[PDB]
Amino acid sequence: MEITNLKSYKELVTLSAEEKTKDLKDYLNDKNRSESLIKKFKNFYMDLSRQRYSEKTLNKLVEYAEEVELKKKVEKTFMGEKVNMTENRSVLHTALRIPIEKINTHKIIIDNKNVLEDVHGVLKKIEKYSDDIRNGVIKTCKNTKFKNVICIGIGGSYLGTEFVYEAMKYYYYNMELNKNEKDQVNNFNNNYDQDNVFNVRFLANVDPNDVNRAIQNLDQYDTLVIIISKTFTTAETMLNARSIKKWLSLKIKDDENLSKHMVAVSTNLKLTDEFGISRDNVFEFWDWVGGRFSVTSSVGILPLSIAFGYKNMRNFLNGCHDMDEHFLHADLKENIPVLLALTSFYNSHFFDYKNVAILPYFQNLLKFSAHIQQLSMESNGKSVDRNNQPIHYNTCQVYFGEPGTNGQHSFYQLIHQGQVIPVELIGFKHSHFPIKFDKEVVSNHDELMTNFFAQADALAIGKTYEQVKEENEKNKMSPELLTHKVFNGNRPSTLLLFDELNFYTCGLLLSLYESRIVAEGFLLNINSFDQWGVELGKVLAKEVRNYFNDTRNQKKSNTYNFNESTKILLNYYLS
Amino acid sequence: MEITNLKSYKELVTLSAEEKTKDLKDYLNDKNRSESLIKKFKNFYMDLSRQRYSEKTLNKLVEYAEEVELKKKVEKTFMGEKVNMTENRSVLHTALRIPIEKINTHKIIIDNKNVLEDVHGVLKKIEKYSDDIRNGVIKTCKNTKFKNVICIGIGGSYLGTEFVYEAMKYYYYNMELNKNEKDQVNNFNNNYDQDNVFNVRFLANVDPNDVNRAIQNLDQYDTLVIIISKTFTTAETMLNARSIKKWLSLKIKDDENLSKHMVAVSTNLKLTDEFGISRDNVFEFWDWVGGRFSVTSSVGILPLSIAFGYKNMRNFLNGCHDMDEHFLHADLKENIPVLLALTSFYNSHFFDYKNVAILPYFQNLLKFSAHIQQLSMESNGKSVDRNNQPIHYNTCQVYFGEPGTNGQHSFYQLIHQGQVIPVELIGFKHSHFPIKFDKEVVSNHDELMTNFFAQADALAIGKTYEQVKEENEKNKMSPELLTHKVFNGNRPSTLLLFDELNFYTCGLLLSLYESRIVAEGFLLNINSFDQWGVELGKVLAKEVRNYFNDTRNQKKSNTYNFNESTKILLNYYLS
C-alpha cells in the first residue's frame, strides 16, 4: 500500500483544503502560534511560522511521521542497517563525525569490525598529513611549502567541499589569520598574502575550459593535486587527473618528485599505485558513504584540513555530530530536521509547490545552493517507492537559489507575483567582514538583514487591492493599472537565524540539510540512497565516444544506431 | 477576453492530449520531421525535434502566435511604441546594437530626436575611453596602467555583464593575447600575466562579505571603480559605492586623483557630480533600456570594452543586431526565438512543465543561467495580463541550471527519474582551450560532447521495463528491484549547437534569449517590461532599517507594527 492511502495523509488532504482559505497575516498575529513554530537549537532559531498550517495541522503532520514509522527508519539508518534497499547497503555518513571519545560507546559493527576504528584511522592520517603540509614538514619538489591545491572530482566529490570552502575561508582569514575581533569593523588592512592561505581550485568539469581555469597563473612547483574517486576509474575525473598529471610533468619530471605533488581519495589501491601515487598519499572512504553525503569523510576533510587546519575541521565535525544526535533523539514535535522535512512534504504534496528556493543572506554561502541541489535532487528525485512500486505522487522539488540580496534583485519578482515558490532564508547575526561608517544609518550587515526580515513578511502578508488603492490616493496612477501592484501574499517561508557562521555552525547547517533529506525520503517512502537514473546517459555517451573515435581517426571498429536528429547534428559537429 | 478563450489555444488543449499518447522515440525515426524541426541561422543549429509535438501541432502553435498578433506586437516594440503599458514606456534595447551605417535608415524618433544619435554618442565615448585605458593614455594616480576593475551594481546592472565577461575572457586571452590556433592543442604555456589582462570583480551584494571579496589582494592604486545605477540612489549599489570610495581613500587622498579611479554609468548628473565623479567619466543610458536588457548599453559595453577592447564588443553588438533582424523579419515558422518561445509556452501550458533547465556544455558559460534567470523570471513572472485582468494560468517557469557535465553529476537523477523538467542544451564544436593527448580515445572537448548528444537522446527515448529485464539476464539483480532501473523517456529537450563561442556568437546567444523572452511575454499576454513585484519588500525593509537605526543607537525617532514572529526574531538578532 502507498503513502496516499494512510489515514493521516487522507486527513492532511482535507486539512490543507481548509488551510488554503486562511491567511498567514492572521496567523502571524497569534503570539502563541509563533512561540510554538519558532524552535531553538544551540546557536540558532528556526522559524516555521510563515507556513500555511495551524498548530493542529502541524500536529497531524507529526501523526503522519509516526504512521510512516519515521523514527524507526532513522534509527535503523544510524544503527548501520541496510536501508539502501536497491543496492543492499548501509548508510553511515553519520559515523564519519562521531568523536574519538565515543569510539566504543557508539561503536557500529559491520563485518565483525567497529567502523569507527576505520573512521578515526583515516582522520588521524589527515590530521598528521595536513599538519605536516601546513607546518612545512611535507614540502614540494623544490623544498618549499605548498601554496595551491587542485581538487579533481565530480558531483559529490567536490560540491560539499566547495560549499564549506567558500563558506569558511573568510572566517579563517579574518578571525584566525588576521585575528579580527567582533567589537572592530572596517578591517581593510587584513593581509591575504601570508603563510597557509592556500589557493584552492575545483576541477570538476570534463570540459578542457575547466582545466584552463584550474591551472590559470599556477606554478606546478607550488601545487598539490588531490584526485577524488572511489573507483579511480570515473571517466571525467580520471581524464582530468591524466591532464593535470601531464601539466605537472611539464616541470616535475621525476616520479618521486611527482608523488610529493599528488594525493588520492580512493579505495582502489591498485589504480592509485599505477597512477604513481604513494601509499601514504591515499586516503580511504567506504561504500556506506554516499557521494552526496561524502564531505565529512576524507573527500572533504582532507582538502579542508589542508586549507584551514584539522582543529577547525574537528569543530565542523562536532557541529555535524551534535545536529545528528538531535535528529536521532529529539521527539518529532521538537525535531528541527524532521519539522523541516514535514513542511517540505506538506508544501509539495498538499499545495503542489514543486520548487524550493535556497536563499542564504550571506555571500560566503554562494556555493551552498549548488550542494543542496545535488543532496536533495539526486537523493529524492525518484519515481519508485520502497516497495518497488512505480509511483505517481510528487517526489523531490526543483531546488535553486542565489545568496540574498543577489537573488532578490534577480528573480524575486516571480517569487512575489508569479508562481508560488516556498523559500528557505538563512541569516546570521554577525558578518565575516563587518563594515560601518559613522554617517551611515546602519552597518552594511544590518542593511543586508533588513531584507532577510522584510522579504519573509512581504511574502506572507502581501498587499491587497484596497491597500494599493489607498496609496494611489496620492500617486494618482490610472486606476485600471492598480491590479499590477497587488501582492496576494500567503507565500510561505522558513527562517534560519544563526549567531555566527563559524566551523561548528557550518557543521550544524550541513547536518541539518543531510538530516532533512534523509527524513524526507522516508516520508516520501522512496530510497534516498541510490542513483540508478544516471546510468542511461553514461551508456549512450560511451556509444557517441566510440563513434567520435572511429570518425576522428577515420578507422572502422562497434555498430551505431543513431536516431534521425542525432545523425544530422553529429554530421554538423564532425564537419 | 483571455488567451485561454482563443480558438487555437482550445485546439492546442486537445492536440496536446493526443501528443501525450505519442513517444519521442517514434518521432525521432522520422527523418522528415527531424529536417523540419532542425533550423539553421548563421553559425548554429537549433534542434526542436525532442519536443512533444508533430509538425501539425507545431503549425497550430504558429497559428496561436498569429492569433495573438505576435508579429504586430514585436514590430511595435522595435518601432519604439510604448509597449510597456503599465509604466507607459518604450522598449528599445534593440536600438543599442543598430550599427552606425544604419543611423539614418533605421532611425527611431522619440521626442523629436533620433535615439540612434544618443546610442552612438555613448558608444564613441566608450570606444575612446576604453582605447585610452588599454593603451595607457588614461593612467592611474601613480601614472601607471589600470590593472583592476570593480563593477558596482545590482541585478541587471551586472548579471548580463558577468555572463559575457566569464564567457569571453578565455577566448580573448587564448585566441587574441596568446594567438592560439585551431590546429593546435595543449596550450599550457599560455601567459595570463601580461598587459590588458584586467582583474574584473563584480560587487553586487550589499552584504559586506562581498566588499571583502571585491577588494581581496587589490591595490587601490591599480583599481578603476565603475558604479552602475540609473538614479545613483539605489540603496545597495550606493552603500557599496560609498564603501569602495572609503577603501580607495585609504591610499588615494586627493579629489582629482580619486576622480581618475571612478566612473559612473548613470543619468543622474547631479548625484555623480556630488559623488566626485568627473563629467567625462559618466556614461549614459536611457529609460527605454530595462535593467535586465541593459548589457548592450554602456552598463555592459563600458566594462567589457575595457576588459576586451571596443573592436571585440562591436562584433558582440553585430551578433545581437543580426539575431534582432532575424527575430523581427523571419516568418514565424522559420523564426528561431519565436519557435523557442512557442515550445516553452506549449510545455508550460499544455504539459504543466513549470521549470526550465539551462544547461550549457561549456564551463565558460557558468554565469549564463544566472543572467537567464533574471531575464526570464523578472520579465515573465507576472499574474496580471495586458488587459489589466488578474490571471490564473501559468506564467514564467522557474529557471535554473549548471554547465554540463557539472549539472549532469549533480541533479540529472531527478531530470531522468523524478519530475519532468524540459532542458535547453547549448554546445559548441570548438573549445576555448583544446586538449588532446596521443593515447586518449578522444580529445577532452569530444569527451564533454559525447554527453551533449547522449543526454538529449536518453531523456527522449528512456529505457523500458523489458529492456531493463533483458539486461538483467546477465546482471541477475533480484527481479523485484528492476522497476528502479526504468527510464520512462518522453522528457523534452532543445539542442543549440554553435561552431565556436566568439564575440559575434555570444551576441547571437544573448539576443536569442532576449528575443525569446519578449516573444513569450506576448504569447502569455503579460507585460514583460515592468517589475512592480519588487516594491513591497523594499518598503518593509526600510521600516526594519529605521528600527535597527533606533535600536542600535538607543535613540527614539517612526511607528513600528511588526507581527508576532518578527518581534521574536528581531529581539534575538539585536541581543
mmCIF file of N, CA, C and O in Angstrom, chain A residues 28 34 49 166 170 174 192 205 207 212-213 216 242-243 355 363-364 381 383 388 404-405 413 417 429 440 446-447 457 483-484 533 545 552 563-566 572-573, chain B residues 28 34 49 166 170 174 192 205 207 212-213 216 242 355 363-364 381 383 388 404-405 413 417 429 440 446-447 457 483-484 533 545 552 563-566 572-573:
data_model
loop_
_atom_site.group_PDB
_atom_site.id
_atom_site.type_symbol
_atom_site.label_atom_id
_atom_site.label_comp_id
_atom_site.label_asym_id
_atom_site.label_seq_id
_atom_site.Cartn_x
_atom_site.Cartn_y
_atom_site.Cartn_z
ATOM 1 N N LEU A 28 0.029 35.213 11.848
ATOM 2 C CA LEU A 28 1.152 35.982 12.397
ATOM 3 C C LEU A 28 0.801 36.978 13.522
ATOM 4 O O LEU A 28 1.708 37.559 14.118
ATOM 5 N N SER A 34 3.228 31.573 17.092
ATOM 6 C CA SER A 34 4.601 31.993 16.785
ATOM 7 C C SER A 34 5.585 31.345 17.742
ATOM 8 O O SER A 34 6.594 30.795 17.294
ATOM 9 N N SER A 49 6.807 29.763 11.260
ATOM 10 C CA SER A 49 5.508 30.431 11.382
ATOM 11 C C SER A 49 4.895 30.947 10.085
ATOM 12 O O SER A 49 3.671 31.107 10.020
ATOM 13 N N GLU A 166 34.203 27.843 0.443
ATOM 14 C CA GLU A 166 33.753 29.217 0.241
ATOM 15 C C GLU A 166 33.083 29.814 1.492
ATOM 16 O O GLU A 166 33.267 30.996 1.768
ATOM 17 N N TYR A 170 36.835 33.028 4.582
ATOM 18 C CA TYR A 170 36.944 34.374 5.146
ATOM 19 C C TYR A 170 36.880 34.362 6.640
ATOM 20 O O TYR A 170 37.512 35.203 7.263
ATOM 21 N N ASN A 174 40.046 36.091 8.286
ATOM 22 C CA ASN A 174 39.733 37.284 9.070
ATOM 23 C C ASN A 174 39.831 37.079 10.576
ATOM 24 O O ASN A 174 40.468 37.895 11.250
ATOM 25 N N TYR A 192 46.067 38.980 3.014
ATOM 26 C CA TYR A 192 45.647 37.736 2.368
ATOM 27 C C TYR A 192 46.802 37.033 1.628
ATOM 28 O O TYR A 192 46.595 35.998 1.010
ATOM 29 N N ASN A 205 34.508 19.921 -14.141
ATOM 30 C CA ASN A 205 34.003 19.656 -15.482
ATOM 31 C C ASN A 205 35.037 18.943 -16.361
ATOM 32 O O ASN A 205 36.218 19.288 -16.318
ATOM 33 N N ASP A 207 35.041 19.366 -19.417
ATOM 34 C CA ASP A 207 35.296 20.400 -20.414
ATOM 35 C C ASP A 207 36.766 20.874 -20.216
ATOM 36 O O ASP A 207 37.101 21.305 -19.111
ATOM 37 N N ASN A 212 41.759 24.761 -17.984
ATOM 38 C CA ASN A 212 42.292 26.097 -18.175
ATOM 39 C C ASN A 212 42.089 26.972 -16.939
ATOM 40 O O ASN A 212 43.027 27.645 -16.487
ATOM 41 N N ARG A 213 40.876 26.951 -16.378
ATOM 42 C CA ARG A 213 40.545 27.698 -15.161
ATOM 43 C C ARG A 213 41.330 27.164 -13.967
ATOM 44 O O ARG A 213 41.860 27.944 -13.174
ATOM 45 N N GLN A 216 45.318 28.263 -14.423
ATOM 46 C CA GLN A 216 45.464 29.722 -14.553
ATOM 47 C C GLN A 216 46.453 30.323 -13.528
ATOM 48 O O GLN A 216 46.105 30.305 -12.344
ATOM 49 N N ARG A 242 44.623 12.699 -15.515
ATOM 50 C CA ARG A 242 45.677 12.458 -16.511
ATOM 51 C C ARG A 242 46.156 13.771 -17.135
ATOM 52 O O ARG A 242 47.371 13.966 -17.307
ATOM 53 N N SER A 243 45.213 14.701 -17.392
ATOM 54 C CA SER A 243 45.523 16.011 -17.954
ATOM 55 C C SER A 243 46.354 16.859 -16.982
ATOM 56 O O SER A 243 47.326 17.489 -17.395
ATOM 57 N N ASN A 355 8.776 23.438 -6.078
ATOM 58 C CA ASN A 355 10.069 24.121 -6.066
ATOM 59 C C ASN A 355 10.444 24.530 -4.663
ATOM 60 O O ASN A 355 9.562 24.691 -3.825
ATOM 61 N N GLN A 363 26.816 36.247 1.396
ATOM 62 C CA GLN A 363 27.583 35.979 0.185
ATOM 63 C C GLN A 363 28.577 34.794 0.306
ATOM 64 O O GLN A 363 28.796 34.106 -0.690
ATOM 65 N N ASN A 364 29.142 34.527 1.517
ATOM 66 C CA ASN A 364 30.065 33.402 1.675
ATOM 67 C C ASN A 364 29.392 32.050 1.499
ATOM 68 O O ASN A 364 30.064 31.080 1.212
ATOM 69 N N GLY A 381 14.854 12.626 -6.079
ATOM 70 C CA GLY A 381 14.283 12.745 -7.429
ATOM 71 C C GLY A 381 14.104 11.347 -7.992
ATOM 72 O O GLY A 381 14.884 10.886 -8.825
ATOM 73 N N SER A 383 11.061 7.846 -8.718
ATOM 74 C CA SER A 383 9.685 7.574 -9.120
ATOM 75 C C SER A 383 9.259 6.142 -8.794
ATOM 76 O O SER A 383 8.318 5.624 -9.398
ATOM 77 N N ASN A 388 9.029 -1.104 -4.201
ATOM 78 C CA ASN A 388 9.372 -1.319 -5.620
ATOM 79 C C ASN A 388 8.247 -1.051 -6.588
ATOM 80 O O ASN A 388 8.305 -1.476 -7.745
ATOM 81 N N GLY A 404 21.114 36.119 -0.913
ATOM 82 C CA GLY A 404 20.487 37.426 -0.802
ATOM 83 C C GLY A 404 21.588 38.447 -0.518
ATOM 84 O O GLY A 404 22.578 38.114 0.153
ATOM 85 N N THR A 405 21.502 39.675 -1.039
ATOM 86 C CA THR A 405 20.434 40.296 -1.823
ATOM 87 C C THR A 405 20.513 40.002 -3.327
ATOM 88 O O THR A 405 19.647 40.481 -4.054
ATOM 89 N N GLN A 413 10.811 38.959 -8.331
ATOM 90 C CA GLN A 413 9.595 39.440 -8.998
ATOM 91 C C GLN A 413 8.616 38.234 -9.120
ATOM 92 O O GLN A 413 7.448 38.344 -8.737
ATOM 93 N N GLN A 417 5.054 37.693 -7.362
ATOM 94 C CA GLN A 417 3.887 37.854 -8.235
ATOM 95 C C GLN A 417 3.609 36.777 -9.284
ATOM 96 O O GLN A 417 2.563 36.812 -9.938
ATOM 97 N N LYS A 429 23.715 36.706 12.691
ATOM 98 C CA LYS A 429 23.743 37.937 13.488
ATOM 99 C C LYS A 429 24.996 38.741 13.220
ATOM 100 O O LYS A 429 24.972 39.970 13.337
ATOM 101 N N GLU A 440 26.568 56.617 8.281
ATOM 102 C CA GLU A 440 25.569 55.683 7.765
ATOM 103 C C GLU A 440 24.468 55.410 8.752
ATOM 104 O O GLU A 440 24.720 55.342 9.952
ATOM 105 N N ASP A 446 23.662 45.079 8.857
ATOM 106 C CA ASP A 446 22.277 45.410 9.237
ATOM 107 C C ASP A 446 21.476 45.753 7.990
ATOM 108 O O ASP A 446 20.337 45.316 7.892
ATOM 109 N N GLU A 447 22.073 46.470 7.022
ATOM 110 C CA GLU A 447 21.377 46.789 5.765
ATOM 111 C C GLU A 447 20.955 45.492 5.034
ATOM 112 O O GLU A 447 19.808 45.384 4.615
ATOM 113 N N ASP A 457 8.235 38.593 5.630
ATOM 114 C CA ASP A 457 6.966 39.238 5.934
ATOM 115 C C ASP A 457 6.183 39.661 4.680
ATOM 116 O O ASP A 457 4.984 39.431 4.644
ATOM 117 N N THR A 483 -4.236 46.711 -10.415
ATOM 118 C CA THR A 483 -4.170 45.246 -10.305
ATOM 119 C C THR A 483 -2.713 44.745 -10.393
ATOM 120 O O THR A 483 -2.346 43.818 -9.682
ATOM 121 N N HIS A 484 -1.884 45.404 -11.239
ATOM 122 C CA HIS A 484 -0.458 45.112 -11.437
ATOM 123 C C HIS A 484 0.376 45.287 -10.159
ATOM 124 O O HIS A 484 1.464 44.742 -10.060
ATOM 125 N N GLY A 533 19.293 6.503 -11.974
ATOM 126 C CA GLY A 533 18.960 7.440 -13.036
ATOM 127 C C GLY A 533 20.111 8.002 -13.827
ATOM 128 O O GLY A 533 19.906 8.654 -14.862
ATOM 129 N N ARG A 545 31.143 8.321 -27.864
ATOM 130 C CA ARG A 545 32.601 8.280 -27.692
ATOM 131 C C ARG A 545 33.270 7.400 -28.766
ATOM 132 O O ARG A 545 34.215 7.864 -29.402
ATOM 133 N N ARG A 552 36.967 10.570 -36.064
ATOM 134 C CA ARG A 552 38.129 11.468 -35.987
ATOM 135 C C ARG A 552 39.399 10.824 -36.554
ATOM 136 O O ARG A 552 40.226 11.516 -37.149
ATOM 137 N N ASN A 563 19.413 7.981 -33.907
ATOM 138 C CA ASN A 563 18.140 8.431 -34.452
ATOM 139 C C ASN A 563 18.383 9.486 -35.558
ATOM 140 O O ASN A 563 19.518 9.950 -35.737
ATOM 141 N N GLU A 564 17.332 9.855 -36.292
ATOM 142 C CA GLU A 564 17.453 10.799 -37.397
ATOM 143 C C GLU A 564 17.972 12.186 -37.022
ATOM 144 O O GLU A 564 18.728 12.780 -37.798
ATOM 145 N N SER A 565 17.603 12.702 -35.828
ATOM 146 C CA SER A 565 18.087 14.024 -35.415
ATOM 147 C C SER A 565 19.549 13.996 -35.044
ATOM 148 O O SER A 565 20.307 14.878 -35.479
ATOM 149 N N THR A 566 19.956 12.990 -34.236
ATOM 150 C CA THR A 566 21.355 12.878 -33.821
ATOM 151 C C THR A 566 22.297 12.708 -34.980
ATOM 152 O O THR A 566 23.374 13.307 -34.957
ATOM 153 N N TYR A 572 27.079 17.691 -38.448
ATOM 154 C CA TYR A 572 27.486 19.082 -38.305
ATOM 155 C C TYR A 572 28.671 19.161 -37.326
ATOM 156 O O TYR A 572 29.695 19.755 -37.655
ATOM 157 N N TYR A 573 28.551 18.512 -36.165
ATOM 158 C CA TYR A 573 29.594 18.527 -35.126
ATOM 159 C C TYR A 573 30.966 18.056 -35.659
ATOM 160 O O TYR A 573 32.002 18.630 -35.314
ATOM 161 N N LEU B 28 11.486 10.424 -33.480
ATOM 162 C CA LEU B 28 12.905 10.503 -33.849
ATOM 163 C C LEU B 28 13.364 9.543 -34.966
ATOM 164 O O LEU B 28 14.504 9.644 -35.418
ATOM 165 N N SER B 34 12.507 15.471 -38.426
ATOM 166 C CA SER B 34 13.806 15.942 -37.931
ATOM 167 C C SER B 34 14.319 17.089 -38.783
ATOM 168 O O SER B 34 14.733 18.113 -38.234
ATOM 169 N N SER B 49 13.524 18.814 -32.270
ATOM 170 C CA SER B 49 12.909 17.507 -32.527
ATOM 171 C C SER B 49 12.568 16.674 -31.297
ATOM 172 O O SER B 49 11.687 15.811 -31.381
ATOM 173 N N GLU B 166 32.705 36.265 -18.174
ATOM 174 C CA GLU B 166 33.144 34.888 -17.972
ATOM 175 C C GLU B 166 33.129 34.062 -19.271
ATOM 176 O O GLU B 166 34.016 33.237 -19.473
ATOM 177 N N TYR B 170 38.410 33.861 -21.726
ATOM 178 C CA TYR B 170 39.371 32.871 -22.214
ATOM 179 C C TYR B 170 39.503 32.906 -23.704
ATOM 180 O O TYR B 170 40.584 32.636 -24.206
ATOM 181 N N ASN B 174 43.251 33.482 -24.863
ATOM 182 C CA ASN B 174 43.814 32.372 -25.629
ATOM 183 C C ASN B 174 43.960 32.659 -27.118
ATOM 184 O O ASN B 174 45.036 32.415 -27.671
ATOM 185 N N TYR B 192 49.079 34.544 -18.757
ATOM 186 C CA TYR B 192 47.922 35.263 -18.222
ATOM 187 C C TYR B 192 48.323 36.484 -17.373
ATOM 188 O O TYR B 192 47.462 37.163 -16.829
ATOM 189 N N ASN B 205 26.373 42.177 -4.015
ATOM 190 C CA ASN B 205 25.646 42.032 -2.760
ATOM 191 C C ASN B 205 25.928 43.183 -1.789
ATOM 192 O O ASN B 205 27.074 43.615 -1.667
ATOM 193 N N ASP B 207 25.798 42.718 1.259
ATOM 194 C CA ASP B 207 26.492 42.001 2.322
ATOM 195 C C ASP B 207 27.964 42.508 2.332
ATOM 196 O O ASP B 207 28.626 42.410 1.297
ATOM 197 N N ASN B 212 34.522 42.473 0.913
ATOM 198 C CA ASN B 212 35.719 41.713 1.225
ATOM 199 C C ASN B 212 36.236 40.943 0.012
ATOM 200 O O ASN B 212 37.439 40.984 -0.290
ATOM 201 N N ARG B 213 35.334 40.259 -0.698
ATOM 202 C CA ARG B 213 35.672 39.514 -1.914
ATOM 203 C C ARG B 213 36.125 40.461 -3.021
ATOM 204 O O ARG B 213 37.111 40.187 -3.707
ATOM 205 N N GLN B 216 39.883 41.945 -2.020
ATOM 206 C CA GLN B 216 40.854 40.858 -1.812
ATOM 207 C C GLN B 216 42.125 41.011 -2.677
ATOM 208 O O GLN B 216 41.988 40.867 -3.895
ATOM 209 N N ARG B 242 29.895 53.946 -1.680
ATOM 210 C CA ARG B 242 30.460 54.728 -0.570
ATOM 211 C C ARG B 242 31.545 53.936 0.164
ATOM 212 O O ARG B 242 32.601 54.499 0.496
ATOM 213 N N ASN B 355 9.116 24.325 -15.105
ATOM 214 C CA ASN B 355 10.550 24.551 -14.924
ATOM 215 C C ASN B 355 11.267 24.506 -16.251
ATOM 216 O O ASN B 355 10.771 23.886 -17.186
ATOM 217 N N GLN B 363 31.997 25.162 -19.697
ATOM 218 C CA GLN B 363 32.292 25.784 -18.411
ATOM 219 C C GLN B 363 32.387 27.332 -18.456
ATOM 220 O O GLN B 363 32.023 27.972 -17.470
ATOM 221 N N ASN B 364 32.827 27.934 -19.596
ATOM 222 C CA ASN B 364 32.906 29.393 -19.683
ATOM 223 C C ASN B 364 31.542 30.066 -19.650
ATOM 224 O O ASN B 364 31.459 31.232 -19.322
ATOM 225 N N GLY B 381 7.469 36.614 -14.791
ATOM 226 C CA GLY B 381 6.917 36.121 -13.520
ATOM 227 C C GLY B 381 5.869 37.110 -13.043
ATOM 228 O O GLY B 381 6.106 37.911 -12.139
ATOM 229 N N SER B 383 1.276 38.065 -12.856
ATOM 230 C CA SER B 383 -0.027 37.443 -12.643
ATOM 231 C C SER B 383 -1.178 38.349 -13.080
ATOM 232 O O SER B 383 -2.310 38.177 -12.622
ATOM 233 N N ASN B 388 -5.111 44.207 -17.965
ATOM 234 C CA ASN B 388 -5.147 44.525 -16.525
ATOM 235 C C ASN B 388 -6.000 43.597 -15.696
ATOM 236 O O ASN B 388 -6.354 43.924 -14.559
ATOM 237 N N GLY B 404 27.115 21.761 -18.133
ATOM 238 C CA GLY B 404 27.413 20.344 -18.267
ATOM 239 C C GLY B 404 28.930 20.196 -18.367
ATOM 240 O O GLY B 404 29.600 21.083 -18.921
ATOM 241 N N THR B 405 29.531 19.139 -17.810
ATOM 242 C CA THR B 405 28.957 17.971 -17.142
ATOM 243 C C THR B 405 28.654 18.190 -15.653
ATOM 244 O O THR B 405 28.162 17.259 -15.022
ATOM 245 N N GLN B 413 19.718 13.018 -11.962
ATOM 246 C CA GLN B 413 18.957 11.878 -11.433
ATOM 247 C C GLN B 413 17.446 12.254 -11.487
ATOM 248 O O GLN B 413 16.635 11.484 -12.009
ATOM 249 N N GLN B 417 14.524 10.632 -13.702
ATOM 250 C CA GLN B 417 13.586 9.769 -12.977
ATOM 251 C C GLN B 417 12.589 10.422 -12.018
ATOM 252 O O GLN B 417 11.700 9.741 -11.500
ATOM 253 N N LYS B 429 31.242 23.417 -31.263
ATOM 254 C CA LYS B 429 32.100 22.481 -31.998
ATOM 255 C C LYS B 429 33.539 22.575 -31.541
ATOM 256 O O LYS B 429 34.269 21.582 -31.608
ATOM 257 N N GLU B 440 44.842 8.992 -25.695
ATOM 258 C CA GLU B 440 43.427 9.122 -25.349
ATOM 259 C C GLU B 440 42.516 8.723 -26.477
ATOM 260 O O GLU B 440 42.826 8.979 -27.638
ATOM 261 N N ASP B 446 35.719 16.519 -27.118
ATOM 262 C CA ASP B 446 34.867 15.442 -27.655
ATOM 263 C C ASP B 446 34.282 14.637 -26.506
ATOM 264 O O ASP B 446 33.106 14.302 -26.571
ATOM 265 N N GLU B 447 35.060 14.378 -25.441
ATOM 266 C CA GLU B 447 34.540 13.654 -24.270
ATOM 267 C C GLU B 447 33.339 14.411 -23.654
ATOM 268 O O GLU B 447 32.313 13.794 -23.387
ATOM 269 N N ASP B 457 19.220 12.359 -26.139
ATOM 270 C CA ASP B 457 18.639 11.097 -26.573
ATOM 271 C C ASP B 457 18.114 10.238 -25.412
ATOM 272 O O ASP B 457 17.022 9.705 -25.537
ATOM 273 N N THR B 483 12.171 -2.268 -11.468
ATOM 274 C CA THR B 483 11.361 -1.051 -11.631
ATOM 275 C C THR B 483 12.204 0.217 -11.381
ATOM 276 O O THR B 483 12.031 1.209 -12.079
ATOM 277 N N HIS B 484 13.148 0.149 -10.411
ATOM 278 C CA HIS B 484 14.078 1.227 -10.046
ATOM 279 C C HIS B 484 15.004 1.639 -11.200
ATOM 280 O O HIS B 484 15.552 2.729 -11.184
ATOM 281 N N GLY B 533 6.581 43.922 -8.646
ATOM 282 C CA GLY B 533 6.743 42.929 -7.596
ATOM 283 C C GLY B 533 7.891 43.133 -6.643
ATOM 284 O O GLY B 533 7.987 42.445 -5.617
ATOM 285 N N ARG B 545 15.046 48.878 8.674
ATOM 286 C CA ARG B 545 16.198 49.789 8.686
ATOM 287 C C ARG B 545 16.066 50.849 9.798
ATOM 288 O O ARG B 545 17.011 51.015 10.567
ATOM 289 N N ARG B 552 19.967 50.213 17.631
ATOM 290 C CA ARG B 552 21.434 50.191 17.739
ATOM 291 C C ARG B 552 21.983 51.441 18.434
ATOM 292 O O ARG B 552 22.976 51.356 19.157
ATOM 293 N N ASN B 563 4.792 41.887 13.169
ATOM 294 C CA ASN B 563 3.984 40.744 13.568
ATOM 295 C C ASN B 563 4.667 39.997 14.739
ATOM 296 O O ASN B 563 5.821 40.296 15.079
ATOM 297 N N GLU B 564 3.963 39.043 15.349
ATOM 298 C CA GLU B 564 4.483 38.313 16.499
ATOM 299 C C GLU B 564 5.770 37.528 16.252
ATOM 300 O O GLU B 564 6.626 37.472 17.141
ATOM 301 N N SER B 565 5.937 36.944 15.043
ATOM 302 C CA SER B 565 7.162 36.193 14.751
ATOM 303 C C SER B 565 8.350 37.104 14.566
ATOM 304 O O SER B 565 9.423 36.833 15.130
ATOM 305 N N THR B 566 8.173 38.187 13.774
ATOM 306 C CA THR B 566 9.267 39.130 13.535
ATOM 307 C C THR B 566 9.765 39.781 14.796
ATOM 308 O O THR B 566 10.979 39.945 14.934
ATOM 309 N N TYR B 572 16.092 38.502 19.045
ATOM 310 C CA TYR B 572 17.262 37.637 19.014
ATOM 311 C C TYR B 572 18.372 38.323 18.196
ATOM 312 O O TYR B 572 19.496 38.445 18.677
ATOM 313 N N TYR B 573 18.035 38.820 17.003
ATOM 314 C CA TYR B 573 19.001 39.474 16.105
ATOM 315 C C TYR B 573 19.739 40.649 16.787
ATOM 316 O O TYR B 573 20.946 40.823 16.600
#
